[PDB]
Point group: D2
Chain length 250, copies 4
Amino acid sequence: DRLKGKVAIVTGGTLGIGLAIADKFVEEGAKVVITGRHADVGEKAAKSIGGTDVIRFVQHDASDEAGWTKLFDTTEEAFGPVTTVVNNAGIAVSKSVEDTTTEEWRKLLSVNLDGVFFGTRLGIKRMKNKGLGASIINMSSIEGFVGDPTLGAYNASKGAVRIMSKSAALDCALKDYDVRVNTVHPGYIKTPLVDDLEGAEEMMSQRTKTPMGHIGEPNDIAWICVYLASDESKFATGAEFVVDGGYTAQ
Amino acid sequence: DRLKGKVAIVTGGTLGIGLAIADKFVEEGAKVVITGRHADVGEKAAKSIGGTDVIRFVQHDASDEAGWTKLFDTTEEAFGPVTTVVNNAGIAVSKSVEDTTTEEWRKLLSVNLDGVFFGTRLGIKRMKNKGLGASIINMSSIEGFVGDPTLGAYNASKGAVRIMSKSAALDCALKDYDVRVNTVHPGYIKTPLVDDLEGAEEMMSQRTKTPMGHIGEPNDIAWICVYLASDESKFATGAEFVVDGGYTAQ
Amino acid sequence: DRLKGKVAIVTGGTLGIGLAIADKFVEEGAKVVITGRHADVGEKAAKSIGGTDVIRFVQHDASDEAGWTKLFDTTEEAFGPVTTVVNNAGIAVSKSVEDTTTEEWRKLLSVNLDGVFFGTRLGIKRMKNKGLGASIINMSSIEGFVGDPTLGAYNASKGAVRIMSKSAALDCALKDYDVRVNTVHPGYIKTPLVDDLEGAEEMMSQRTKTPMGHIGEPNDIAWICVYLASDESKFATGAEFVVDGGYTAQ
Amino acid sequence: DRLKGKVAIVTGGTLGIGLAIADKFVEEGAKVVITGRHADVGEKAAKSIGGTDVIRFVQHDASDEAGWTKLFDTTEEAFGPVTTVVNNAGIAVSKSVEDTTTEEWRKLLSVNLDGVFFGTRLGIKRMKNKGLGASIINMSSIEGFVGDPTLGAYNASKGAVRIMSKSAALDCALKDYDVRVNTVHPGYIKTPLVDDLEGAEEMMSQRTKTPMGHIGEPNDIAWICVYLASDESKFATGAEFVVDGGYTAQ
Ligand SMILES: [Cl-]
Ligand SMILES: [Cl-]
Ligand SMILES: [Cl-]
Ligand SMILES: [Cl-]
Ligand SMILES: [Cl-]
Ligand SMILES: [Cl-]
Ligand SMILES: [Cl-]
Ligand SMILES: [Cl-]
Ligand SMILES: [Mg+2]
Ligand SMILES: [Mg+2]
Ligand SMILES: [Mg+2]
Ligand SMILES: [Mg+2]
Ligand SMILES: [Mg+2]
Ligand SMILES: [Mg+2]
């Protein structure tokens, strides 16, 4: 089991990429707490993967600062000390910078930027200096590397996550905290939410977008996250792991 | 005059890099409004460069959304339509991600990220489709490219500015708005604020930090900004201009 | 077994990083041919990993164009169609650009650049359109991202490998060849050759070089290569995978 | 005059981008030697810009190592010590990595990579430690950042130039040589050679290629080169200057 003994929090773990991360983490021997905003969805998601000896759902909005210390406490009471934090919760807004309202701006940043900050900051405090082989995996995207004219606030959030993560990685390395911090950058990934938007997959699959001529699937992101959570990646910190069908290569 | 007919807003234009940008912009024929939080400083700064037919100071905090439309109005009443926005206002916090308080986080992002967003969004709206050769110059830094363990929130802000600017550049290009958007990335620059911190310049000048073995001066940033404001750079958009003594090259 | 059915060529597979790649590839079910310039070393290396039903050594200099088609033939006769090419053979010269002789320049490029070109070009021709889940892993380094004043020709070679690999990745993706191409970028890795150079490991382990305060080991590179050779990484192409202890993050 | 007292060699200076660089360098007060392979073209090119007190043509192939020291001698005899080297000579091949012949590979690298190496190495030796404010400007391209499936060898060459230049920049900075080294990265630029290829400009101008919806002109590259040759850019070294209509921003 590649994640033997690991205890992971996966935010936004009830859907899509986060759900697949949680699934493969359990498959590789980790104990997992998945979070999400909606109880019915989250309860169903946890049970689809396993029983409560390996996976539990906690209702939590990643933008909710006070709930973060309670999420660590709940996870530790269930499974023992947290070793792995996957800051995956996020939302998107389909607006250019020009057309973004301040309400849209602040709401998106509250989840995509503050949530990652809260999970990274608290993960460092709670995991440092414990010999855990701890790993913080911050979900950026291709929109952390390149602009999209229709994703202005999303681009801001993903660029922030990209570079903030390097700061955290360096501090943890320099202080011998035994915590690594890295970013994962999905390209387009097929999910029910993509399926719900008529024409989206076909636009994303055009060769001028994704050179492979199709989009990915959630397990494509789960497998790079297994590598980064595992001790196999003990010399990887401060780096960016791109799984995008070639999007950023052209 | 390389900036003949240009009308520029330079935020944080009363000190340091912003002051030098304003100085060289006036030297090259632009009319300039500089902003800053402190009236005595700003009044002295404007008069040090020129008379009110070429430069004026407006007291404005870049984090103040409502003041942005009034700043454009004041500038346009003085000098005619704005052509050039330099989003240079910014603050720094000397904290790791781990040690950043939420108050510090939100305050720094309010200036460094929201201020750039407000100036970029409003610059697009106010300058598009007017044949102005309009240019938005967003001040990132080397901390938009690489982490610094002691500058966590600053790194987040500068990474956000870096990638958000690409979104804006693309939208403006695709829609034929006649607005370019680019980022400038200073390395270490000697200013009175650096001089006020005992030992700072020497730390910044170590070869493991700045390969040139010294730090820069404000005019180093002013001259790349002249290029980007001028029609000489009419094919440059969505790009990052690094002036750092080699910092990021190693 | 994560590499079930895979058949790999690992150039420079008799020492260091390449040897560890070959070792872990065999552990995960691949059949492997390792190459190197020296027969005694290579024979010992292959036997240290396994018997000839899983690993063989072929004497080959990666700069030797004519030997490439014979290497594929030998590998295919042993194990069936090649699925995976790891272009790892390389040499280093300790010279600035200024101090590099033309002889040094051409010799280093003959292995580090031509060898990767030959293996990539021939891997595409020999592996395309066969439903193999084929993967070409080109060994760049941190010196593909950042300069080192003492490694001028090496930097040229590693930058070339970095961007050439993106071209190949795109062509293969656009043409539905079922071949992925990615680069791996080691930081400093402890090997007998590092051990042979008094003071080298300590210089490499300074925090201003490697933030983790130590260097890596060959298996750190082997594990990212397992991921990239495996079908787990079927949506990853044209990307750069950095395993460097934080070197490039600052 | 922004280049007062400068003495420049511009390789491939008889056509296109190089010709415009030479033109604007003369306009800004530099003395210039342009090189090219064809005497009739080069003689006409030099005379189109000015008389022999400001510009001369020397027939030289940048791949010709022995001719480099004679080119510096000829330039110095005419105009005094060389201060500025623009390594702009280059050729292109329209082949994927897969389809590149070894002859094509070696020929393209002989100009695009060896020529830049020869000019950079010799520029350092001939310009260091003379208080010249010396500047080496190495012409990369967007193909130094991103792959193009049809430009495999070109991508290799441009990636090599990109990273080799950082090595040289660092060495020069660390040794206080008073030599800066930077790369310029044109996107698509309208030239007679583009005009000669039916359909090329329209393909290059598609929004999925160049977001601005048109290609650039040679003076777009000349103006960034003026900045980099001038003392205005005295703190810029080891950096990449992209003038591409947004190509790399998406
Ligand atoms: Cl979903
Ligand atoms: Cl706590
Ligand atoms: Cl100041
Ligand atoms: Cl308004
Ligand atoms: Cl070794
Ligand atoms: Cl063959
Ligand atoms: Cl031409
Ligand atoms: Cl000489
Ligand atoms: Mg609209
Ligand atoms: Mg792109
Ligand atoms: Mg502390
Ligand atoms: Mg660095
Ligand atoms: Mg020497
Ligand atoms: Mg063909």
